[PDB]
Each structure stands twice: as C-alpha cells, then as structure tokens.
Amino acid sequence: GSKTKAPSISIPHDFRQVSAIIDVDIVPETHRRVRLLKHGSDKPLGFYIRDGTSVRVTASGLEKQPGIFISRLVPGGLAESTGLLAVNDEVIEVNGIEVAGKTLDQVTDMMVANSSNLIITVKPANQR
C-alpha cells in the first residue's frame, strides 16, 4: 500500500565538457570495449594482456587468484587512447568469451581465432 518513493530526484551534474582524464576523485569503471579490427592486417593495435595474481580478501583470508590484466600498453593503442585505462586494469571478456578461469595462452589464442571480430572488455583497477 501507499505510493511512497522519490520518483523525481534531480541532482544535475554539470559537465558538458569533453571528458579528458582528469583524475582526482574516483575513477569510474568504464567498461571499455577495446576492439581490434583485423581486416587483411593483423597487428597488435597496442593493447596487451597479462596473467597475474590478483589478491582478494576471501573468507579464507588474503588469497590470490589468477587474473588476466593488461601486460603492456603501447602509445597509440586504443587502450592508451582512452586514457582512463592503465596496464594495471583487469580483462573480463574476449569478443564474447569470458577470460575468467582461463589460461593466458587460451585467451591469446581465442582473440586470434576471433581477431577480425575482437573486442576486449577491460575494467579499471584504479579504484578508490
């Protein structure tokens, strides 16, 4: 019963400026689909992937899980072009294939199998 909510809340954030990486307060998780369009040419666009230990706090304590991150970033590469993303950031998907629980070799192979339609999902580890 009753219709109690706040239907219309209005907190307008003024910012119609083109977003450039100004970093002070909190880096948003821009799930940036970095796509490599392989078409007659198969070049590393500038993003690279890493396999490393991500330390998380579980009920078992501080544990490390294998996670896919960025390994190297080349200036001119789409991941660098976004600016919001750094080598520290985490990888989630390749095209439409999740990389979680998969080997690095497998992730690299997958992105080559699907290089012409390669879209990589990365998520900022620049948390605050």
Side-chain angles (χ1 to χ4, degrees), residues 92-110:
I92 304 72
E93 298 179 276
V94 169
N95 177 270
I97 316 168
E98 300 181 277
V99 305
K102 179 169 289 298
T103 301
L104 184 62
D105 296 72
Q106 290 179 30
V107 181
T108 56
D109 183 79
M110 300 192 314

mmCIF file with all atom_site columns, all heavy atoms in Angstrom, residues 92-110:
data_model
loop_
_atom_site.group_PDB
_atom_site.id
_atom_site.type_symbol
_atom_site.label_atom_id
_atom_site.label_alt_id
_atom_site.label_comp_id
_atom_site.label_asym_id
_atom_site.label_entity_id
_atom_site.label_seq_id
_atom_site.pdbx_PDB_ins_code
_atom_site.Cartn_x
_atom_site.Cartn_y
_atom_site.Cartn_z
_atom_site.occupancy
_atom_site.B_iso_or_equiv
_atom_site.pdbx_formal_charge
_atom_site.auth_seq_id
_atom_site.auth_comp_id
_atom_site.auth_asym_id
_atom_site.auth_atom_id
_atom_site.pdbx_PDB_model_num
ATOM 1   N N   . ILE A 1 92  ? 38.095 -8.852  -18.803 1.00 0.00 ? 92  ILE A N   1
ATOM 2   C CA  . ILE A 1 92  ? 36.916 -9.645  -18.489 1.00 0.00 ? 92  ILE A CA  1
ATOM 3   C C   . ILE A 1 92  ? 36.533 -10.566 -19.653 1.00 0.00 ? 92  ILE A C   1
ATOM 4   O O   . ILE A 1 92  ? 36.365 -11.778 -19.473 1.00 0.00 ? 92  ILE A O   1
ATOM 5   C CB  . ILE A 1 92  ? 35.657 -8.764  -18.088 1.00 0.00 ? 92  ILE A CB  1
ATOM 6   C CG1 . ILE A 1 92  ? 35.950 -7.817  -16.917 1.00 0.00 ? 92  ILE A CG1 1
ATOM 7   C CG2 . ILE A 1 92  ? 34.480 -9.641  -17.698 1.00 0.00 ? 92  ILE A CG2 1
ATOM 8   C CD1 . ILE A 1 92  ? 36.842 -6.655  -17.241 1.00 0.00 ? 92  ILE A CD1 1
ATOM 9   N N   . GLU A 1 93  ? 36.428 -10.008 -20.853 1.00 0.00 ? 93  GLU A N   1
ATOM 10  C CA  . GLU A 1 93  ? 35.945 -10.787 -21.992 1.00 0.00 ? 93  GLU A CA  1
ATOM 11  C C   . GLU A 1 93  ? 36.755 -10.561 -23.244 1.00 0.00 ? 93  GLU A C   1
ATOM 12  O O   . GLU A 1 93  ? 37.350 -9.500  -23.445 1.00 0.00 ? 93  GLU A O   1
ATOM 13  C CB  . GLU A 1 93  ? 34.485 -10.455 -22.329 1.00 0.00 ? 93  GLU A CB  1
ATOM 14  C CG  . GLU A 1 93  ? 33.474 -10.751 -21.248 1.00 0.00 ? 93  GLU A CG  1
ATOM 15  C CD  . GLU A 1 93  ? 32.084 -10.375 -21.674 1.00 0.00 ? 93  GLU A CD  1
ATOM 16  O OE1 . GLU A 1 93  ? 31.709 -9.185  -21.529 1.00 0.00 ? 93  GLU A OE1 1
ATOM 17  O OE2 . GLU A 1 93  ? 31.346 -11.234 -22.180 1.00 0.00 ? 93  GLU A OE2 1
ATOM 18  N N   . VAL A 1 94  ? 36.753 -11.578 -24.064 1.00 0.00 ? 94  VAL A N   1
ATOM 19  C CA  . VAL A 1 94  ? 37.318 -11.567 -25.407 1.00 0.00 ? 94  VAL A CA  1
ATOM 20  C C   . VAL A 1 94  ? 36.202 -11.874 -26.387 1.00 0.00 ? 94  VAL A C   1
ATOM 21  O O   . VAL A 1 94  ? 35.731 -13.002 -26.437 1.00 0.00 ? 94  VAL A O   1
ATOM 22  C CB  . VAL A 1 94  ? 38.448 -12.635 -25.569 1.00 0.00 ? 94  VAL A CB  1
ATOM 23  C CG1 . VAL A 1 94  ? 38.839 -12.811 -27.028 1.00 0.00 ? 94  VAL A CG1 1
ATOM 24  C CG2 . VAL A 1 94  ? 39.671 -12.239 -24.780 1.00 0.00 ? 94  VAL A CG2 1
ATOM 25  N N   . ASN A 1 95  ? 35.757 -10.859 -27.121 1.00 0.00 ? 95  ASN A N   1
ATOM 26  C CA  . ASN A 1 95  ? 34.651 -10.957 -28.108 1.00 0.00 ? 95  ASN A CA  1
ATOM 27  C C   . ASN A 1 95  ? 33.318 -11.154 -27.397 1.00 0.00 ? 95  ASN A C   1
ATOM 28  O O   . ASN A 1 95  ? 32.469 -10.264 -27.366 1.00 0.00 ? 95  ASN A O   1
ATOM 29  C CB  . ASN A 1 95  ? 34.903 -12.082 -29.149 1.00 0.00 ? 95  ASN A CB  1
ATOM 30  C CG  . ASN A 1 95  ? 33.741 -12.259 -30.137 1.00 0.00 ? 95  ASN A CG  1
ATOM 31  O OD1 . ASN A 1 95  ? 32.816 -13.040 -29.897 1.00 0.00 ? 95  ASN A OD1 1
ATOM 32  N ND2 . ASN A 1 95  ? 33.783 -11.558 -31.236 1.00 0.00 ? 95  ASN A ND2 1
ATOM 33  N N   . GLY A 1 96  ? 33.176 -12.300 -26.819 1.00 0.00 ? 96  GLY A N   1
ATOM 34  C CA  . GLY A 1 96  ? 32.014 -12.655 -26.067 1.00 0.00 ? 96  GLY A CA  1
ATOM 35  C C   . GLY A 1 96  ? 32.312 -13.881 -25.265 1.00 0.00 ? 96  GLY A C   1
ATOM 36  O O   . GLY A 1 96  ? 31.417 -14.627 -24.866 1.00 0.00 ? 96  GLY A O   1
ATOM 37  N N   . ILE A 1 97  ? 33.594 -14.101 -25.059 1.00 0.00 ? 97  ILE A N   1
ATOM 38  C CA  . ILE A 1 97  ? 34.090 -15.234 -24.344 1.00 0.00 ? 97  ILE A CA  1
ATOM 39  C C   . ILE A 1 97  ? 34.711 -14.693 -23.069 1.00 0.00 ? 97  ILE A C   1
ATOM 40  O O   . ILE A 1 97  ? 35.569 -13.808 -23.143 1.00 0.00 ? 97  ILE A O   1
ATOM 41  C CB  . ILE A 1 97  ? 35.241 -15.915 -25.131 1.00 0.00 ? 97  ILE A CB  1
ATOM 42  C CG1 . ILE A 1 97  ? 34.911 -16.036 -26.631 1.00 0.00 ? 97  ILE A CG1 1
ATOM 43  C CG2 . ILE A 1 97  ? 35.464 -17.307 -24.547 1.00 0.00 ? 97  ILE A CG2 1
ATOM 44  C CD1 . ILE A 1 97  ? 36.110 -16.420 -27.501 1.00 0.00 ? 97  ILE A CD1 1
ATOM 45  N N   . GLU A 1 98  ? 34.298 -15.164 -21.924 1.00 0.00 ? 98  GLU A N   1
ATOM 46  C CA  . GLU A 1 98  ? 34.865 -14.692 -20.702 1.00 0.00 ? 98  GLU A CA  1
ATOM 47  C C   . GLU A 1 98  ? 36.245 -15.303 -20.507 1.00 0.00 ? 98  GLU A C   1
ATOM 48  O O   . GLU A 1 98  ? 36.475 -16.473 -20.850 1.00 0.00 ? 98  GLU A O   1
ATOM 49  C CB  . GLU A 1 98  ? 33.969 -15.027 -19.529 1.00 0.00 ? 98  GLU A CB  1
ATOM 50  C CG  . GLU A 1 98  ? 32.576 -14.440 -19.602 1.00 0.00 ? 98  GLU A CG  1
ATOM 51  C CD  . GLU A 1 98  ? 31.736 -14.786 -18.393 1.00 0.00 ? 98  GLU A CD  1
ATOM 52  O OE1 . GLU A 1 98  ? 31.152 -15.896 -18.349 1.00 0.00 ? 98  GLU A OE1 1
ATOM 53  O OE2 . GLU A 1 98  ? 31.656 -13.969 -17.462 1.00 0.00 ? 98  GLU A OE2 1
ATOM 54  N N   . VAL A 1 99  ? 37.146 -14.531 -19.960 1.00 0.00 ? 99  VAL A N   1
ATOM 55  C CA  . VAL A 1 99  ? 38.526 -14.974 -19.791 1.00 0.00 ? 99  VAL A CA  1
ATOM 56  C C   . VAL A 1 99  ? 38.771 -15.532 -18.398 1.00 0.00 ? 99  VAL A C   1
ATOM 57  O O   . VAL A 1 99  ? 39.848 -16.052 -18.112 1.00 0.00 ? 99  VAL A O   1
ATOM 58  C CB  . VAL A 1 99  ? 39.532 -13.825 -20.054 1.00 0.00 ? 99  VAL A CB  1
ATOM 59  C CG1 . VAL A 1 99  ? 39.304 -13.231 -21.425 1.00 0.00 ? 99  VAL A CG1 1
ATOM 60  C CG2 . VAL A 1 99  ? 39.454 -12.744 -18.981 1.00 0.00 ? 99  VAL A CG2 1
ATOM 61  N N   . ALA A 1 100 ? 37.779 -15.440 -17.546 1.00 0.00 ? 100 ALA A N   1
ATOM 62  C CA  . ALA A 1 100 ? 37.934 -15.851 -16.168 1.00 0.00 ? 100 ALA A CA  1
ATOM 63  C C   . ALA A 1 100 ? 38.086 -17.355 -16.046 1.00 0.00 ? 100 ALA A C   1
ATOM 64  O O   . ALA A 1 100 ? 37.247 -18.122 -16.527 1.00 0.00 ? 100 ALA A O   1
ATOM 65  C CB  . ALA A 1 100 ? 36.781 -15.344 -15.319 1.00 0.00 ? 100 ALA A CB  1
ATOM 66  N N   . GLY A 1 101 ? 39.181 -17.767 -15.439 1.00 0.00 ? 101 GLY A N   1
ATOM 67  C CA  . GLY A 1 101 ? 39.425 -19.171 -15.219 1.00 0.00 ? 101 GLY A CA  1
ATOM 68  C C   . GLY A 1 101 ? 40.120 -19.815 -16.382 1.00 0.00 ? 101 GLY A C   1
ATOM 69  O O   . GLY A 1 101 ? 40.267 -21.039 -16.428 1.00 0.00 ? 101 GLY A O   1
ATOM 70  N N   . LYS A 1 102 ? 40.529 -19.019 -17.326 1.00 0.00 ? 102 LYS A N   1
ATOM 71  C CA  . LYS A 1 102 ? 41.169 -19.496 -18.474 1.00 0.00 ? 102 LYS A CA  1
ATOM 72  C C   . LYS A 1 102 ? 42.650 -19.163 -18.441 1.00 0.00 ? 102 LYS A C   1
ATOM 73  O O   . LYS A 1 102 ? 43.072 -18.220 -17.764 1.00 0.00 ? 102 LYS A O   1
ATOM 74  C CB  . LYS A 1 102 ? 40.481 -18.864 -19.643 1.00 0.00 ? 102 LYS A CB  1
ATOM 75  C CG  . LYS A 1 102 ? 41.018 -19.226 -20.958 1.00 0.00 ? 102 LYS A CG  1
ATOM 76  C CD  . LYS A 1 102 ? 40.113 -18.754 -22.038 1.00 0.00 ? 102 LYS A CD  1
ATOM 77  C CE  . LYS A 1 102 ? 38.823 -19.560 -22.075 1.00 0.00 ? 102 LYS A CE  1
ATOM 78  N NZ  . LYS A 1 102 ? 39.063 -20.994 -22.369 1.00 0.00 ? 102 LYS A NZ  1
ATOM 79  N N   . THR A 1 103 ? 43.427 -19.933 -19.168 1.00 0.00 ? 103 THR A N   1
ATOM 80  C CA  . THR A 1 103 ? 44.848 -19.747 -19.223 1.00 0.00 ? 103 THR A CA  1
ATOM 81  C C   . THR A 1 103 ? 45.154 -18.551 -20.143 1.00 0.00 ? 103 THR A C   1
ATOM 82  O O   . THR A 1 103 ? 44.351 -18.226 -21.027 1.00 0.00 ? 103 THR A O   1
ATOM 83  C CB  . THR A 1 103 ? 45.451 -21.048 -19.808 1.00 0.00 ? 103 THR A CB  1
ATOM 84  O OG1 . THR A 1 103 ? 45.089 -22.156 -18.964 1.00 0.00 ? 103 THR A OG1 1
ATOM 85  C CG2 . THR A 1 103 ? 46.964 -20.990 -19.973 1.00 0.00 ? 103 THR A CG2 1
ATOM 86  N N   . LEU A 1 104 ? 46.320 -17.937 -19.974 1.00 0.00 ? 104 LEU A N   1
ATOM 87  C CA  . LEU A 1 104 ? 46.714 -16.787 -20.776 1.00 0.00 ? 104 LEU A CA  1
ATOM 88  C C   . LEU A 1 104 ? 46.814 -17.184 -22.240 1.00 0.00 ? 104 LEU A C   1
ATOM 89  O O   . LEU A 1 104 ? 46.323 -16.478 -23.122 1.00 0.00 ? 104 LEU A O   1
ATOM 90  C CB  . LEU A 1 104 ? 48.056 -16.242 -20.295 1.00 0.00 ? 104 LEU A CB  1
ATOM 91  C CG  . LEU A 1 104 ? 48.546 -14.963 -20.981 1.00 0.00 ? 104 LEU A CG  1
ATOM 92  C CD1 . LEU A 1 104 ? 47.582 -13.813 -20.739 1.00 0.00 ? 104 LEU A CD1 1
ATOM 93  C CD2 . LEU A 1 104 ? 49.935 -14.599 -20.503 1.00 0.00 ? 104 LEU A CD2 1
ATOM 94  N N   . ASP A 1 105 ? 47.430 -18.334 -22.467 1.00 0.00 ? 105 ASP A N   1
ATOM 95  C CA  . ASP A 1 105 ? 47.597 -18.924 -23.780 1.00 0.00 ? 105 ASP A CA  1
ATOM 96  C C   . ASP A 1 105 ? 46.269 -19.133 -24.450 1.00 0.00 ? 105 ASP A C   1
ATOM 97  O O   . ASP A 1 105 ? 46.137 -18.966 -25.659 1.00 0.00 ? 105 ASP A O   1
ATOM 98  C CB  . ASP A 1 105 ? 48.286 -20.267 -23.637 1.00 0.00 ? 105 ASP A CB  1
ATOM 99  C CG  . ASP A 1 105 ? 49.674 -20.168 -23.087 1.00 0.00 ? 105 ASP A CG  1
ATOM 100 O OD1 . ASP A 1 105 ? 49.824 -19.885 -21.882 1.00 0.00 ? 105 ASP A OD1 1
ATOM 101 O OD2 . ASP A 1 105 ? 50.649 -20.353 -23.856 1.00 0.00 ? 105 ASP A OD2 1
ATOM 102 N N   . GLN A 1 106 ? 45.270 -19.471 -23.658 1.00 0.00 ? 106 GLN A N   1
ATOM 103 C CA  . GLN A 1 106 ? 43.969 -19.719 -24.170 1.00 0.00 ? 106 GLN A CA  1
ATOM 104 C C   . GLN A 1 106 ? 43.315 -18.415 -24.567 1.00 0.00 ? 106 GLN A C   1
ATOM 105 O O   . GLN A 1 106 ? 42.730 -18.317 -25.622 1.00 0.00 ? 106 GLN A O   1
ATOM 106 C CB  . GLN A 1 106 ? 43.142 -20.473 -23.145 1.00 0.00 ? 106 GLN A CB  1
ATOM 107 C CG  . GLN A 1 106 ? 43.572 -21.904 -22.914 1.00 0.00 ? 106 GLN A CG  1
ATOM 108 C CD  . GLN A 1 106 ? 42.719 -22.590 -21.871 1.00 0.00 ? 106 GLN A CD  1
ATOM 109 O OE1 . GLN A 1 106 ? 41.532 -22.272 -21.705 1.00 0.00 ? 106 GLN A OE1 1
ATOM 110 N NE2 . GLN A 1 106 ? 43.302 -23.511 -21.156 1.00 0.00 ? 106 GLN A NE2 1
ATOM 111 N N   . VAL A 1 107 ? 43.472 -17.403 -23.735 1.00 0.00 ? 107 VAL A N   1
ATOM 112 C CA  . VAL A 1 107 ? 42.897 -16.090 -24.006 1.00 0.00 ? 107 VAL A CA  1
ATOM 113 C C   . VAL A 1 107 ? 43.534 -15.470 -25.255 1.00 0.00 ? 107 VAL A C   1
ATOM 114 O O   . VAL A 1 107 ? 42.829 -14.893 -26.096 1.00 0.00 ? 107 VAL A O   1
ATOM 115 C CB  . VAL A 1 107 ? 43.050 -15.134 -22.789 1.00 0.00 ? 107 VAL A CB  1
ATOM 116 C CG1 . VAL A 1 107 ? 42.422 -13.786 -23.072 1.00 0.00 ? 107 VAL A CG1 1
ATOM 117 C CG2 . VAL A 1 107 ? 42.436 -15.739 -21.540 1.00 0.00 ? 107 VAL A CG2 1
ATOM 118 N N   . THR A 1 108 ? 44.848 -15.607 -25.390 1.00 0.00 ? 108 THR A N   1
ATOM 119 C CA  . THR A 1 108 ? 45.527 -15.078 -26.548 1.00 0.00 ? 108 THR A CA  1
ATOM 120 C C   . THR A 1 108 ? 45.089 -15.816 -27.812 1.00 0.00 ? 108 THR A C   1
ATOM 121 O O   . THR A 1 108 ? 44.830 -15.202 -28.835 1.00 0.00 ? 108 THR A O   1
ATOM 122 C CB  . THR A 1 108 ? 47.073 -15.118 -26.408 1.00 0.00 ? 108 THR A CB  1
ATOM 123 O OG1 . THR A 1 108 ? 47.536 -16.450 -26.128 1.00 0.00 ? 108 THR A OG1 1
ATOM 124 C CG2 . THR A 1 108 ? 47.562 -14.175 -25.322 1.00 0.00 ? 108 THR A CG2 1
ATOM 125 N N   . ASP A 1 109 ? 44.961 -17.130 -27.707 1.00 0.00 ? 109 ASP A N   1
ATOM 126 C CA  . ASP A 1 109 ? 44.542 -17.959 -28.835 1.00 0.00 ? 109 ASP A CA  1
ATOM 127 C C   . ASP A 1 109 ? 43.150 -17.581 -29.279 1.00 0.00 ? 109 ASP A C   1
ATOM 128 O O   . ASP A 1 109 ? 42.884 -17.416 -30.476 1.00 0.00 ? 109 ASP A O   1
ATOM 129 C CB  . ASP A 1 109 ? 44.576 -19.430 -28.451 1.00 0.00 ? 109 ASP A CB  1
ATOM 130 C CG  . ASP A 1 109 ? 44.216 -20.340 -29.605 1.00 0.00 ? 109 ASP A CG  1
ATOM 131 O OD1 . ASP A 1 109 ? 45.082 -20.584 -30.473 1.00 0.00 ? 109 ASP A OD1 1
ATOM 132 O OD2 . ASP A 1 109 ? 43.058 -20.837 -29.657 1.00 0.00 ? 109 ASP A OD2 1
ATOM 133 N N   . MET A 1 110 ? 42.265 -17.410 -28.311 1.00 0.00 ? 110 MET A N   1
ATOM 134 C CA  . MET A 1 110 ? 40.883 -17.045 -28.588 1.00 0.00 ? 110 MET A CA  1
ATOM 135 C C   . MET A 1 110 ? 40.790 -15.731 -29.311 1.00 0.00 ? 110 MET A C   1
ATOM 136 O O   . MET A 1 110 ? 40.021 -15.595 -30.261 1.00 0.00 ? 110 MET A O   1
ATOM 137 C CB  . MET A 1 110 ? 40.032 -16.953 -27.328 1.00 0.00 ? 110 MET A CB  1
ATOM 138 C CG  . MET A 1 110 ? 39.916 -18.208 -26.514 1.00 0.00 ? 110 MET A CG  1
ATOM 139 S SD  . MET A 1 110 ? 38.629 -18.077 -25.261 1.00 0.00 ? 110 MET A SD  1
ATOM 140 C CE  . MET A 1 110 ? 38.967 -16.458 -24.546 1.00 0.00 ? 110 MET A CE  1
#
